[PDB]
């Protein structure tokens, strides 16, 4: 049927539109991360984290929508080889972007730890390298440098929660093949 | 017809019953994740065996991935065998953090090399079984070590939902 054909292709086009939309958000997040690691004023850092929090929020919403639409498209192609192939192709591209997001947040977590460590040597010049690593790795023990250590410490906790969300989403999409 | 998947379930149930069901002396047993059947050459354990290696050298073994019960981030790799009475038994264990390099044999569809402290050459029974298991091994690594991967040699990066760009940002090297 003609109308049955463009209906499924409308689903694929919508998914592919949200896929590229999702890819842009992920790259904007990566860029906000690297800008936040520069010397910025208090008002400039607040503006950057405003956009970053918005981008993070958009990413979570698009992940819900892509999860539902890709699963729904896969069910429409259970006995149609052409429909199954397109939906599977959408599923693989979604997973690659989830992998990009995970790796992007992984890089930011390391560089945020390295910044928190170097910032801990200022607040405690006598502290040794091991005492610095142990302090940053939560928890045991919590100047402009002090507030940043507490801030990046609370940020590492939210990065780990986001990466746990991506792992769960990643496995939710693998229970489809 | 559908023997591969059905035998995988028998192996899974038997591996769990023999190896991941009784507690130690004294955490509970590890949690099974996946496995694959492998061929190990006893004379050529660390490199591709030459074609004229006699069949007596070929030993039936299995690789098993599991997780510690109270820490799903501590994954272990096991090499197991089937005893004469049919019981499965684990003979060698690595920590997943020991995995440094994973290489695909360009000439043998079933062969691969895992590098911990030593290099280990193994072969799956079929080409598809190498693809599925190595995908499970690498996927579990990225998930376990927060977006990191070991060195990958001669694999299609899209198998692990990676590209050259994301691989370079994630590799431990």
Author numbering:
A (entry chain A): 33 to 174, 191 to 225
B (entry chain B): 75 to 99, 102 to 249
Task: Provide excerpts from the study.
The exocyst is an evolutionarily conserved octameric protein complex that mediates the tethering of post-Golgi secretory vesicles to the plasma membrane. Most syntaxin proteins contain an N-terminal region that autonomously folds into a three-helix bundle (the ‘Habc domain') that interacts intramolecularly with their SNARE motif to generate a ‘closed' conformation, which, in many cases, blocks its assembly into the SNARE complex345678910. The rate-limiting step is the interaction between Sso and Sec9, which is hindered by the auto-inhibition of Sso. Here we report that the exocyst subunit Sec3 directly interacts with Sso1/2, and promotes the initial assembly of the Sso-Sec9 t-SNARE complex and stimulates membrane fusion.
We have obtained the crystal structure of the Sec3–Sso2 complex under two different crystallization conditions, both of which demonstrate that the binding of Sec3 leads to conformational changes on Sso that is crucial for the relief of its auto-inhibition. Consistent with previously reports of Sec3 lipid-binding domain2324, the core of Sec3N folds into a PH domain that contains a β-barrel formed by two sets of β-sheet with a helix capping one end. The interface between Sec3N and Sso2 is ∼700 Å2, which is mediated primarily by 13 hydrogen bonds and 10 salt bridges. The seven main interface residues on Sec3 consist of K149, Q219, E222, H224, Y237, R241 and R245, which together describe a horseshoe-like shape on a relatively flat surface of the Sec3 PH domain. These residues provide a platform to make extensive contacts with Hc of Sso2, and some contacts with the SNARE motif of Sso2. In the Sso2-Sec3 crystal structure, the N terminus of the H3 domain bends approximately 22° away from its original position, and is tilted towards the Ha domain. The crystal structure suggests that Sec3 interaction causes the bending of the SNARE motif, which then led to the disruption of the hydrophobic interactions in the core of Sso2 involving HL2. Such changes could facilitate the release of the SNARE motif of Sso2 from its Habc domain when Sec9 is available. The four Sec3/Sso2 dimers in the two crystal forms are essentially identical. Both the bending of the SNARE motif N-terminus and the relaxation of HL2 of Sso2 described above are found in all four copies of the Sec3/Sso2 complex present in the two different crystal forms.
